[PDB]
Amino acid sequence: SMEQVAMELRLTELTRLLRSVLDQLQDKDPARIFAQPVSLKEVPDYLDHIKHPMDFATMRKRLEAQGYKNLHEFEEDFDLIIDNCMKYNARDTVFYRAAVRLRDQGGVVLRQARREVDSIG
């Protein structure tokens, strides 16, 4: 149908907007602390602590499969990266501090992305 195609064009445009957002969020992690999943070979107990692991490469695979229906689902995944880190790592660690900074700096980007998604529909 012609509707399904129109739908697919907007999903594709959302994917386009979210791709740009993801690149901007990832630029706020220059140390690449959140770039890849936490290694289960190197942290074998991780899943006893964190039930829903997330990282920027995993978000990217979902993104490119157009697996994000809306910005809310995307934000959920971003928030997991942050919140998982702030639970597993103590406050005085480079990792915890890196998450706080990504959260703070990320807020500006997500703020504008919400306006852009509402605005363009």
Side-chain angles (χ1 to χ4, degrees), residues 1-2 4-6 8 11-15 17-40 42-60 62-68 70-110 112-119 121:
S1 91
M2 193 48 252
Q4 287 302 326
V5 167
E8 286 151 10
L11 185 57
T12 292
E13 282 310 306
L14 175 66
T15 304
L17 191 144
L18 295 180
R19 185 177 303 114
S20 157
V21 174
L22 186 60
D23 290 340
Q24 286 177 73
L25 294 174
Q26 194 154 25
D27 285 336
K28 304 322 178 137
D29 175 28
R32 300 194 65 89
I33 290 164
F34 308 104
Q36 292 295 323
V38 169
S39 180
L40 307 184
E42 301 171 9
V43 191
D45 80 341
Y46 189 62
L47 304 183
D48 299 344
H49 294 271
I50 297 302
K51 303 295 172 187
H52 301 101
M54 191 45 52
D55 64 272
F56 282 134
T58 302
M59 287 190 60
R60 211 172 283 284
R62 177 169 172 190
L63 183 60
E64 291 309 332
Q66 308 180 334
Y68 292 113
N70 49 57
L71 184 57
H72 179 78
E73 288 187 337
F74 182 92
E75 289 174 298
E76 283 186 353
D77 270 353
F78 180 68
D79 286 342
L80 276 175
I81 292 169
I82 296 313
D83 292 337
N84 289 346
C85 179
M86 288 176 78
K87 286 165 193 73
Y88 186 79
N89 303 103
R91 196 151 49 247
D92 72 344
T93 60
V94 67
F95 302 107
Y96 183 111
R97 289 157 173 286
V100 166
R101 293 163 61 79
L102 181 59
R103 189 193 64 189
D104 292 351
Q105 294 200 284
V108 189
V109 172
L110 294 170
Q112 208 54 36
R114 164 54 65 200
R115 296 193 65 84
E116 285 173 303
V117 155
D118 291 1
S119 185

